Each structure stands twice: as C-alpha cells, then as structure tokens.
C-alpha cells in the first residue's frame, strides 16, 4: 500500500521533503497612496496597485535528528528570495512606493502602552515626523534605517535601527520545528507537535485559539476524503487555520481536490472570539489583530483587497476590489498521496491608523484599517514531477 510516503533515510518522499523540487515563487504587491494630505483631513484614501515584484524562493532544511523509535523528526526550513526581473514589473531598487511611516506608528503604540513613554513622546515632539514617507520598493521589505529607531538604538541597543517587513528573512528559519511521521500512523504524517519548545501558543486568550493543529503547510497526509476539514499552521498567520472542500479540479494529468479558506476563519463567530485580544472588542469579520504576534505593531492581517471581509472595510478605502481567483487562497492536492499539486496563498498586511489628540503627526485622519501590501506564494507542479508521479499502486 502507501507505506512509501513516510520518511526515513532513502525514501523518495524524504529527498523531496528535504530539498523541494517544486519551484516556489513569491510576488509582492504594494498600494501606492495618491492623496496623502487629503487623508489628513478626514477623507477616504485613494491607493493604487504596484505589483508584481516576483521573487523565487529557495527551500531546503537542516538540523535533522530522528527521535524516539523513529516516529519523531526535527528540522528547520530556510527561505532565500532570489529576484526574477522577467516576471516582475519594474526594479525594486528604483521604483518608489509611498505608504504609512510604520516605524513612527509602532513607537506611538509603544508609547500608548508603556515602555519608554516619556522619552519617546518627548523625542517625537523634538524630531519632526511625517505620516507618509516615500522609500524604494526594495527598501520597504528588506530594511531601512529611518531616524527614530536609530535614536532609540542608543538608549536600548536591544532593538535594531533598521525597519522592514521581510527584514533579514533571507537565509534564516522561522524558529525550531519538531514534526511527526506516518510510522505510528499515516494520519499524522507531517503534523506539528511543537514549535519553539512550546506545545501550544500563548498569544491568544482561550485554550482552543492557542492550539497548534495541522502541518507546516506544504505537505499533507495520503488518502484524503472530499469532506475533510484539514488544518494547517502557517507561521506568519499566528494561528491554526483550516481548509474545506470547494470543487473538483485536475492539475496536469492528476486528479485533485481544491481546498479554500472559509469565511468563518477571521469571522465574528464565538469560535473566533478568543482572538479578540482587546477582550471581546473584535473588529469586523475578516481581519485578524496579529499585533502581539508582531512586535508591538498594530499590524492587522486580512485577505487581499479585504476578500470575505465585511463591507465596512472595503468602502473605507477607495481602490479595493475583492473577487475570487484573484484574492482567494486555495490549495489543490492529489487526494491519493496528499502531495501539493497547485497552491496559491495570499496574505495582506495592514496598519491600524486613527487620529490621536496626543500626537499631531496623525492629523485629522480617519479611524480605519489601512492597507499596505499583499503577496502571493504560489507553487505549481510540472510534468517531469507529474510523469514521475506514475505510481498508482505497487
């Protein structure tokens, strides 16, 4: 039967699990603001799309030691983003993009809640800051020095003067990771048992929200039924998400099931009430407050263009057009082996922006979830990996 899918030394599934053969590509899309001064009057913002800047990922894993009877493995996966000019529109080292000065909003939050309350707030009143800064596309997601964090670097060399979204995420891992294997049973093939020494999360409120159900994200257990609610733990989303059935699709020559993300994820049901870290003060359905996840930022997670989100968030920003096949996140997997055929995962990063009476930098801006950037990490199988997949049963 399908005892060929579990991983020991020499298994064909182990070599693909170490160094993935499928080329993973990542495309970033930014939102250029058009009328900044008008937003500072209490208006509706106007943003423009500036994608894509495609980056080809390099995946491989190190630190691998089989524990116990051989039923547990441990590893750490790496991501190296190589730029690909052909599929990208413009050069990230040339093109400029204009969004919110996220660093000056972070320290305001660190000022809001305590930390270096008086000395930041004094320094902010001392050094003049604009709400909307213009840096290059490469500068935003790969780090820039700005001014404040260079000055806060003096009092607490803890923090780094550089700020960025994917700041120095090239070549490093997403922390420790100990996995299971289908030795005891194939059901828990690549199920995560512990992330960084913790068998459960601690960011959220209820015990259910803090669980870690599922897999690392890019592998599944064989013999899937078309009613399975498969779980998955992405490290960037700070929670366990699940995927249900959509419709039948055939990628290359193999049959597959297309799984998508329901609206109950990030919804406003009582199952998502434990994520309301403001203690029952959840925002509209479709947004996650992943601030504690991230340092202390007021980074709001959502789907691109606020897909499956409430109507309030879409109308609050002019230039948001959600729709399927553009902003849905789906994964087409071979039901037999559980191997990823074609997947498309789309996250969006937002910043909570409201006007404050203690800070003139905000001006008269509206209280809203302001969008910044969204990306597509897509992987699609090719024929030489599909013609290798001639194994029906043996």
């Amino acid at each position: 039967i399908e005892k060929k899918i579990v991983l020991r030394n020499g298994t064909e599934a182990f070599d693909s699990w170490e160094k993935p053969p499928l080329p993973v590509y990542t495309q970033f899309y930014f939102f250029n603001v058009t009328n900044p001064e008008e937003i500072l009057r209490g208006e509706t913002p106007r943003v423009e799309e500036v994608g894509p800047y495609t980056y080809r990922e390099l995946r491989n894993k190190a630190n691998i030691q089989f524990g116990d009877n051989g039923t547990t493995i441990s590893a750490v996966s790496n991501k190296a983003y190589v730029f690909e000019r052909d599929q990208s529109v413009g050069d990230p080292k040339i093109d400029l993009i204009r969004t919110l000065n996220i660093p000056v909003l972070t320290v305001i939050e660190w000022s809001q809640v305590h930390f270096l309350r008086e000395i930041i707030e004094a320094m902010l009143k001392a050094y003049q800051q604009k709400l909307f800064v213009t840096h290059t596309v490469d500068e935003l997601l790969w780090g820039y020095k700005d001014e404040i964090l260079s000055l806060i670097h003096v009092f607490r060399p803890d923090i780094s003067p550089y700020f960025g979204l994917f700041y120095e995420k090239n070549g490093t891992n997403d922390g420790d990771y100990v996995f299971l294997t289908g030795e005891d049973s194939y059901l828990n093939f690549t199920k995560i048992v512990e992330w960084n020494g913790k068998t459960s999360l601690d960011w959220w409120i209820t015990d259910k929200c803090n669980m870690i159900n599922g897999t690392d994200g890019d592998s599944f257990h064989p013999l899937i039924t078309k009613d399975e609610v498969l779980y998955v733990f992405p490290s960037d989303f700070c929670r366990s998400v699940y995927i249900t059935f959509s419709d039948y699709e055939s990628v290359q020559g193999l049959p597959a099931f297309r799984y998508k993300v329901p609206a109950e994820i990030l919804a406003n049901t009582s199952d998502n009430a434990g994520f309301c870290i403001p203690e029952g003060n959840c925002l509209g359905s479709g947004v996650l407050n992943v601030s504690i996840c991230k340092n202390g930022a007021p980074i709001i997670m959502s789907f691109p263009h606020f897909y499956q989100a409430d109507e309030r968030f879409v109308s609050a920003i002019e230039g948001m057009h959600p729709n399927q096949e553009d902003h849905e996140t789906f994964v087409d997997i071979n039901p037999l082996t559980g191997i990823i055929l074609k997947a498309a995962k789309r996250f969006q990063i937002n910043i909570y922006v409201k006007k404050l009476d203690d800070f003139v930098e905000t001006g008269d801006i509206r209280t809203m979830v302001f969008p910044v950037m969204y990306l597509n990490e897509s992987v699609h199988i090719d024929k030489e990996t599909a013609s290798r997949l001639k194994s029906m049963i043996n």
Partner: antibody, heavy 122, light 105 residues
Framework: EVQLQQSGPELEKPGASVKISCMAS????????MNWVKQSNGKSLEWIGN????????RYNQKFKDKATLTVDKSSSTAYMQLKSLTSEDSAVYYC???????????????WGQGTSVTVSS | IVMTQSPATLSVTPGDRVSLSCRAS??????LHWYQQKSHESPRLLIK?????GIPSRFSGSGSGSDFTLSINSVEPEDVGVYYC?????????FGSGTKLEIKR
Amino acid sequence: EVQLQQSGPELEKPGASVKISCMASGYSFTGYNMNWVKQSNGKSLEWIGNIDPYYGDTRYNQKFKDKATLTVDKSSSTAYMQLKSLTSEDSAVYYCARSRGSTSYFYGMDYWGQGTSVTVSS
Amino acid sequence: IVMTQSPATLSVTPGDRVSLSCRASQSISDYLHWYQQKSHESPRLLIKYQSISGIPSRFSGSGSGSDFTLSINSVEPEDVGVYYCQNGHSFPFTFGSGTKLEIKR
C-alpha cells in the same frame, strides 16, 4: 465642551502694551493650534497668528508680525498675546479658537473663546 | 488672496432660500469654511470644505474650484447674522467682508 475662557476686558494708554490669555480647558492642549483673530467692531475679521505647542511654531501674518508676539504656557494650556506699541487703531475685540495640524492648508476654528475688548485710549 | 463675494445684505423671508457667493483670487481648490457670527456671540464654524458641517443643522454648501455658494433651504429668523469665508489655502487665509442676512416680515 472644550471651554475657552479669555482674559477680561482691558484698557491701556497709547504706546503701552497688553497681554491677553485664552486659558483652554476640556482637551489635550499639546495637540491643537489655538489661533488668534482680531475682529474690530467693524467685524473686519483679521487673522493675527498661529502658535503650535507640540513644536513651538510661530507663524503670524506679516501685517501684525511687528506688533504681536504669541507665547506658550504648556500647563493650563493658557496662551498669551503681547500687543506692542499700541495705537488707537488697535481698539478691537480679540477672539481665539482651536485648530489642528497644518504643514500646508488650514482647517477651521472648531471652538472659539468669548472675546476680549481692548480699548486703546488716553 | 482677497475674497469678497455678492456683497452684501438682504432679507430672505421666513421661507425662500438663499445663496451668498465667495470669489477667490487664486484657485484654492476646495478650502472654504464659512463662519457664522450672531448678534452678540463669538463666530461659530458652519461649513468646512464646501460639504461638511459639525452640529449646526440644515445648512449646505456648493461649489469648488474658485467660487463657492452657501445655501439655507428652510430659513428661519433665528439665523440673522453675518457670514464670512476663510481661505484655508496659502495663508494668511484671511476672511471676507461678510454679508448680513436680514429677514422680512
């Protein structure tokens, strides 16, 4: 809310000086602009100057730049105006009102004070 | 940067509507504020950037670009006073001469 209580009516001889205050209340003072306006009994509304507590900004109209100086007060959010070398032409009613942000165009005086009558006479 | 516009006085009628325009030397886009000062009171905002208000009731503002227009649809005797514009663009903003709105009876 957001009371604005201006210092009472005052008389001063030509060539002297006057200092008036608006003494804010009901909001975080460090955030708003607090403009000064001179509306002669004729109503010829005039815009005197702009202070900014957060940065210590100073901009005044150039028709009153040689005459008035605006000072701060941080606490009590009070706000002073120094009239220099008085002329009988400066006999006026001086209001004050809140504003916010700038670095460009202007918004509007949300809430005004009562007004102070300045009689310049010997 | 001088203002001036439809100067300046009249008596609508406990009914009919009004206008009251304001002209600009420069283009100024859409930054006019239209303050109302009753008989013995401090000036009170009214219309922000030719659309907004605050808490003063049934008033309105039309026009953009270089010229503007106030409007009272219902008009009662309680709003007898003076109305000044203010350029929010390139300072010193300055005001207008004002128009006194009377009322017949």
